[PDB]
């Protein structure tokens, strides 16, 4: 996935930040969650 | 004019001045981004 910049004008858009994206077998063998803002998995508020 | 609005039932309930806003209670969100108009009190 490629990102350029918010203010970039449509004329000259070039890659600025590459970002590899994948899936992993994420697990938490020795921890749990104490604050879960929203029920929906993978939401913005859930970042905290 | 009454003050901060806490609970709506409409006749919204306005914070009791004797104790509310309880100093202990505060918004618990750094990823809030609520937007619109963020009225706050203390």
């Amino acid at each position: 996935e490629f990102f350029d910049g918010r203010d970039a004008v449509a004329g000259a858009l070039a890659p600025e930040i590459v970002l590899y994206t994948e899936n992993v077998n994420l697990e938490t063998p020795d921890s749990h969650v104490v604050y879960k803002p929203e029920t929906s998995n993978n939401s913005h508020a859930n970042l905290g | 004019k009454e003050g901060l609005q806490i609970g709506k039932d409409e006749k919204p309930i306005y914070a009791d001045k004797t104790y509310q806003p309880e100093p202990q209670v505060g918004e618990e969100s750094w990823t809030d981004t609520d937007g619109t108009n963020e009225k706050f009190g203390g």
Side-chain angles (χ1 to χ4, degrees):
Chain A
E1 304 338 310
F2 305 107
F3 303 71
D4 195 341
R6 198 225 53 69
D7 38 353
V9 67
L13 301 203
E16 191 46 10
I17 288 304
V18 172
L19 241 191
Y20 296 4
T21 63
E22 65 282 52
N23 301 21
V24 311
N25 317 52
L26 191 71
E27 54 182 331
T28 57
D30 61 357
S31 63
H32 53 293
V33 180
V34 163
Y35 188 46
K36 177 93 151 205
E38 301 313 317
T39 166
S40 52
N41 213 320
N42 277 55
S43 161
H44 167 66
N46 245 33
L47 280 176
Chain B
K1 199 181 292 98
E2 300 287 291
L4 185 68
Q5 170 306 328
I6 39 156
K8 213 178 297 311
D9 79 86
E10 290 85 59
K11 185 70 219 81
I13 297 132
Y14 290 106
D16 189 343
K17 52 178 30 66
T18 61
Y19 61 109
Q20 273 148 207
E22 275 284 82
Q24 32 273 54
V25 192
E27 167 152 279
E28 324 94 309
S29 205
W30 73 265
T31 323
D32 198 34
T33 323
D34 272 14
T36 322
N37 47 2
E38 297 277 273
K39 298 309 184 325
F40 272 110

